[PDB]
Amino acid sequence: MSNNSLTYFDKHTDSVFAIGHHPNLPLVCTGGGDNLAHLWTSHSQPPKFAGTLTGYGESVISCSFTSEGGFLVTADMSGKVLVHMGQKGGAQWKLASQMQEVEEIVWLKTHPTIARTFAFGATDGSVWCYQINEQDGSLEQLMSGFVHQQDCSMGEFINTDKGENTLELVTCSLDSTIVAWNCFTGQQLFKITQAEIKGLEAPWISLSLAPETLTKGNSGVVACGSNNGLLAVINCNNGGAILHLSTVIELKPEQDELDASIESISWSSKFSLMAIGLVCGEILLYDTSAWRVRHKFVLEDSVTKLMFDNDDLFASCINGKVYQFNARTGQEKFVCVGHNMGVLDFILLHPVANTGTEQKRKVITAGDEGVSLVFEVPN
């Protein structure tokens, strides 16, 4: 009950803000407040160090590999984006190109299914989508859009279901607007304003695409999430029609307004559930047909990330633990302990091949203390 981790990586000298994993190689990338990115392996004790990435003007806040496994894309708070090219079957990562089109990047993300593609949003509200040349790793801009009038807090690709050439992105802003884009043309498909949500002010924070298996084939249903407790579930394939809208919490007197902030959203197709996690530490599991809460968990402190995986819900917390819940029962099974300060992000890894052996999943964290921890978790 103090540290049940398997191993760790602690080369960062400041907060570990982002963590990404290669789609096929046992390779982690973490980005930190020391303006560095470190590569290390996820299959050994202790991790093997695989290199340090340099060139940033600020803290690194995004690390993600492209879906096909070529290229690492990293972003920092001075607005720089760097592209490293995988060489020697992922054994060496060479800087291929870089850019700096904005003052500060909030969020990046590499498209889950279309090769060599990524998008990012900035504090000035702008939205950018790029592709990466397969041969030399050069940058190819698809679009640049300036519609949001405050910070572009999050983006999420949609219709990821339809092959290359169907490249669509939903972005949201603290100015209450939500926009969908055709990334290839830079065309704004629809834009949600206060007018569409009863005139409510709703500075958006979180976005999450629903699995098609839960929406009867619709590959464009997105749950949103504001910093004052507003949940909107929108149909991006029907002009952003609102499928659900509610305030998810009734705050207590003089309780923090940001306590209602929806920090993370995750869907479960298996259980027809959508979980949201709040700054006040509440975790709410919604039935995705009736949009009513099914289970409610309450953590000691702020939820920082939620992730459904098989029968479980994983939840990282700013108290420095990662909790694992039985998605069906609601029972706490297992808590990852050993961090001093908060867990800012995490990934979950499965054993690649079925060996007729049990083989546990791994949670690997991004710690505010500058430490990543590797946990083996039940079933």
Residue numbers in the entry: 53 to 431
Paper text:
In the case of Sqt1, we were able to decipher the mode of L10-N peptide binding by X-ray crystallography. These structural analyses showed that the C-terminal domain of Sqt1, which is preceded by a non-essential N-terminal extension of ∼50 amino acids, folds into an eight-bladed WD-repeat β-propeller. Moreover, the binding mode of the N-terminal residues of Rpl10 (L10-N) by the eight-bladed WD-repeat β-propeller of Sqt1, as revealed by X-ray crystallography, allows establishing a refined model for the final pre-60S maturation events that lead to the stable incorporation of Rpl10 and the release of Nmd3. Taken together, we propose that Sqt1 may protect Rpl10 from aggregation before and/or promote its incorporation into almost mature pre-60S subunits in the cytoplasm. We conclude that the β-propeller domains of Sqt1 and Rrb1, which harbour the essential function of these proteins, recognize the very N-terminal residues of Rpl10 and Rpl3.
Subsequently, we could solve the structure of the S. cerevisiae Sqt1 WD-repeat β-propeller domain at 2.0 Å resolution by molecular replacement using the native ctSqt1.52C structure as the search model. Sqt1 and ctSqt1 share a high degree of overall structural conservation and mainly differ in three ctSqt1-specific insertions located in the loops connecting β-strands 1c-1d, 5c-5d and 7c-7d. Analysis of the electrostatic properties revealed that both β-propeller structures notably contain a negatively charged top surface, whereas the bottom sides exhibit a charge-mixed surface. Further Y2H assays showed that the predicted WD-repeat β-propeller domains of Sqt1 (53C construct, deletion of amino acids 1–52) and Rrb1 (60C construct, deletion of amino acids 2–59), which support wild-type growth, are sufficient to mediate the interaction both with full-length or the N-terminal residues of Rpl10 and Rpl3, respectively.
